[PDB]
Amino acid sequence: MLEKVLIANRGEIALRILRACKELGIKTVAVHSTADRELMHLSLADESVCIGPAPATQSYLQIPAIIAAAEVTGATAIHPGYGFLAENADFAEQIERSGFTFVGPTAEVIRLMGDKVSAKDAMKRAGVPTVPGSDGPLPEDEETALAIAREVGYPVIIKAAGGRGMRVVYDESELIKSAKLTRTEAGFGNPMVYLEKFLTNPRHVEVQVLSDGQGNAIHLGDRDCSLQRRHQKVIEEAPAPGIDEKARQEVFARCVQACIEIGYRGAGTFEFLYENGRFYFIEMNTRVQVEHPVSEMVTGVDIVKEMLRIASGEKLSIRQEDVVIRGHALECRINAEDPKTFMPSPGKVKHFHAPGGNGVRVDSHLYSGYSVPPNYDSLVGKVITYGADRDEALARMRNALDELIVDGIKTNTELHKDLVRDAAFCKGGVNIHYLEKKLG
């Protein structure tokens, strides 16, 4: 088992990793900025190093600082969490070159899946397509343009190389004339246009995987993260409800195959747009995600603990047949921001009370007397509920939100209270446009 892990992150995810480490008997090193001296996980850590001043560019993103801290402390592995350096290939690469273990995949794989073109090609080999369109620019030759559009299937969208100069074509009789016109409207200066399928009910559905880098990979089911504001996730659930079971099993199998083909090691997520029966690939997150807990609840697998086991050189443990999705889970991201204007709300928490009881889990670094600093993102806690079915998860989230007190700062709790009583959301299957249209 890994001797000593340096937690190259902050906030709730730092505490999450720390907990996984203690369960496995792994010694911990926390790193923090001067603005983060009050972080809950610091005094639970075996060692703590102040690596720089408040700004993330001068502390948490400083590769030399993190590596110096690892060397001073004798850390044998680094867990980057999510954000910061987690998908920075230069960092993984330095860790490799220095002889440390990275709790995550290789730099090479991070680069592969961090570039749109090479990521697309890797998924194509595994049998998974992207959102249908012209690949890439739509030609001026009429019959080639019409042939591409027909395969894509109407309606189609015609986009400029630059939500601007954008045009929907409903029927193929109007295609040439409309493409023609979208090119003329540039001079943006560039007269390149491409074609993209119009999706009517696009849902964000993503597949969780674990892969040991020794030829084994499994899925831990999927999640729906369609409630988004400015592409920031708000509520997540697992499994994604109302998904065509055949299409799901096919995409699970293809995701597992992809892992094996690209040589993936660690926890990762394949993000898709799901459109009435079909999965279209968007990107792979080559790291753990914020919303991992909902998959933990419905599978009974501890994702962070498995990452650590894999990083220490073990094969999975879990066969696919041992993975059964049971019940339903929900997560609400509690952000220190205005619930209506979404302005961050740094400040002192005079009183923090967490929800409790059956099927209620809380992942948060909040405590009474803690000051949320202005410098970093707004995520302060995650309330996660688990039930026998979606309705029970929702009911438990209603109870949980009623008990949550974060006094002294503004949070998005009221928005959550509205969402778990919202008719469309309670019926289920809302798409990625829902929250922004409803908010205005």
From Swiss-Prot:
Q: Can you state which reaction this protein catalyses?
A: N(6)-biotinyl-L-lysyl-[protein] + hydrogencarbonate + ATP = N(6)-carboxybiotinyl-L-lysyl-[protein] + ADP + phosphate + H(+)
Which annotated residues bind ATP? 116, 159, 196-199, 204, 231, 271, 283
Enzyme Commission identifier(s): 6.3.4.14
Q: Which UniProt keywords apply?
A: ATP-binding, Biotin, Fatty acid biosynthesis, Fatty acid metabolism, Ligase, Lipid biosynthesis, Lipid metabolism, Magnesium, Manganese, Metal-binding, Nucleotide-binding
Pathway, according to UniProt? Lipid metabolism; malonyl-CoA biosynthesis; malonyl-CoA from acetyl-CoA: step 1/1
Quote the record's binding site residues for Mn(2+) 1: 271, 283
Residues binding Mg(2+) 1: 271, 283
Q: How does it assemble?
A: Acetyl-CoA carboxylase is a heterohexamer of biotin carboxyl carrier protein, biotin carboxylase and the two subunits of carboxyl transferase in a 2:2 complex.
Q: What is this protein called?
A: Biotin carboxylase
Q: Which organism is it from?
A: Pseudomonas aeruginosa (strain ATCC 15692 / DSM 22644 / CIP 104116 / JCM 14847 / LMG 12228 / 1C / PRS 101 / PAO1)
